[PDB]
Ligand binder design. Structure first.
Ligand SMILES: NC(=O)CC[C@H](NC(=O)[C@@H](N)CCC(N)=O)C(=O)O
Ligand SMILES: [Cl-]
Length: 513
């Protein structure tokens, strides 16, 4: 049986270590690779995966994983494995990211954005082979999110034998170009911006998928995606046009699943660029924007105007945080107070693809542009190919940039630290380039703290500190809609935002209306 998924854009590549977009993860880490541990689908409950069990030392600084035996690696034209998954695969996977003397560290540019943005290098002091089936992580300090971190895409396990061979053959880049995993699907063909083809991996260690061919039809226009869905040219699609939601609910070919998103959409201010280093200017740009008007016009009601980086469904949420008011007059006065009575010009980057937290960045940019103009700020809307967009914003080239997040592990650390820490400003996904000690003073002890109520207290104050400094314009938390042909059984919406096909089957017959 063949399932066709209409994806929203092209993946950036096939080694998940090197990238941060859900687009890439759906095409790489989710189908092809495994992690040591895995969340139960639809939840953030951690379950055994490549590690069948683990122990944690009483001081929390040592994690020992006992690895599943008999796990086969995939094969391709350049690689046939001579051994099964073991500790060396795990050690290669992490040392490549951590160690600049590992031969693969600079391969494909070595942009381990998650690894570096989460400060995993300062945390993980060693990864040790206890024996062929036992690996030990040694940490410099306790880290409550660490187990959840190992369930994330960036911590996918790559093949050390494959890596060995490709290095000896003088073509190490093939590890990143031609993926070899332990997972349920293997990559068969990729035609850039057109299609991805997968077949079920016969030697897969887990429960076999109920489909044996998986096709991604790369389809960036949401209206075209829905047209294909109605024709059953694809059976699943993400990010429907917000205007389409009403007739989709009446569409008897599909089940329209919906849930509150574990996500956020925002506009990052690059505080390295004038005049965005000025606090009153950031507050003025924030107060000029009517967020409720964006929820109405861009999301067509399907979300909530935001004051905090984390959505209401994330624990630690601080409801006592004080929203910036929509007040252009006062925003103009703040600019005057800042010594900018005649405003200024600034660029506003908007991605060209739909995101779970932003269904139409272009249209939203036009609204913010119109809002900013009322206070004398002239925004220039800029866009890039999705992969290039992320790369250049990571390089700090933007002045302001539209951005967002679906949580990866259910933990507040994965929002506050991964998006707004100093580590993330230097080498991660903090495109505000904001590095602020009183923030660090909260989010860093919060990771090390094991007491849940104490973690809640620290994150609540991190929201206060962040709101006071306005390093980003926090716009929305959005409703998630996932249209699925009724012929599809077994599909489960992921609050962590990836799309999983290893669990789905297709009915015998089909609806032709
Ligand atoms: N600027 C960035 O690196 C963020 C891009 C953003 N990524 C994510 O939200 C992560 N958490 C991947 C998880 C997911 N999308 O399912 C994106 O738009 O994909
Ligand atoms: Cl909020």
């Amino acid at each position: 049986k063949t399932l066709v998924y209409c994806s929203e854009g092209s993946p950036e590549g096939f080694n998940p270590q090197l990238f941060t977009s859900g687009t890439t993860y759906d095409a790489s880490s989710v189908p092809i690779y495994n992690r040591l541990v895995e969340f139960k689908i639809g939840t953030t409950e951690i379950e055994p995966s490549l590690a069948e069990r683990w122990e944690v030392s009483e001081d929390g600084k040592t994690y020992t994983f006992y690895l599943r035996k008999g796990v086969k690696w995939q094969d391709n034209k350049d690689f046939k494995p001579t051994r099964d998954f073991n500790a060396d695969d795990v050690i290669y996977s992490f040392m490549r990211q951590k160690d600049d003397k590992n031969p693969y560290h600079k391969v494909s540019g070595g942009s381990y954005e998650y690894f570096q943005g989460m400060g995993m290098g300062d945390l993980i002091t060693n990864v040790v082979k206890v024996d062929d089936n036992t690996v030990r992580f040694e940490l410099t300090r306790p880290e409550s999110p660490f187990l959840a971190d190992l369930a994330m895409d960036f911590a996918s396990i790559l093949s050390a034998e494959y890596a060995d061979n490709m290095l000896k053959a003088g073509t190490p880049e093939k590890v990143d170009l031609n993926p070899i995993g332990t997972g349920p699907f293997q990559l068969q063909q990729y035609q850039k911006d057109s299609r991805i083809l997968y077949k079920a991996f016969p030697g897969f260690w887990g429960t076999k998928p109920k489909i044996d061919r998986l096709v991604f039809s790369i389809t960036p226009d949401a209206s075209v995606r829905y047209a294909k869905l109605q024709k059953n040219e694809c059976q699943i699609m993400p990010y429907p046009n917000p205007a389409d939601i009403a007739r989709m609910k009446e569409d008897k070919t599909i089940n329209l699943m919906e849930q509150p998103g574990l996500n956020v959409g925002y506009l990052s201010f690059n505080i390295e660029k004038k005049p965005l280093d000025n606090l009153k200017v950031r507050q003025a740009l924030t107060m000029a924007v009517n967020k409720d008007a964006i929820i109405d016009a861009v999301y067509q009601g399907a979300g909530q105007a935001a004051k905090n980086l984390i959505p209401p469904t994330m624990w630690g949420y601080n409801d006592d945080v004080k929203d910036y008011a929509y007040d252009p007059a006062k925003a103009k006065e703040l600019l005057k107070e800042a010594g900018l009575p005649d405003g200024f010009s600034i660029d506003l980057w908007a991605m060209p693809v739909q995101r779970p937290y932003n269904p139409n960045a272009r249209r939203m940019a036009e609204m913010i542009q119109s809002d900013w103009a009322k206070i004398g700020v002239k925004a220039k809307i800029v866009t890039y190919e999705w992969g290039e967009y992320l790369k250049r914003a990571k390089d700090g080239e933007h002045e302001t940039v539209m951005m967002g997040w679906t949580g990866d592990n259910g933990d507040p650390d994965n929002f506050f630290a991964t998006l707004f820490s100093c580590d993330a400003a230097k080498q991660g996904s903090n495109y505000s380039k904001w590095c602020y000690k009183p923030f660090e003073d909260l989010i860093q002890p919060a990771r090390a703290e094991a007491d849940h109520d104490k973690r809640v207290a620290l994150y609540k104050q991190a929201q206060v500190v962040m709101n006071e400094q306005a390093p980003a314009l926090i716009i929305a938390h959005s409703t998630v809609y996932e249209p699925v042909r009724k012929e599809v059984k077994g599909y489960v919406v992921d609050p962590l935002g990836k799309h999983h096909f290893d669990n789905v089957s297709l009915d015998a017959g089909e609806n032709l209306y």
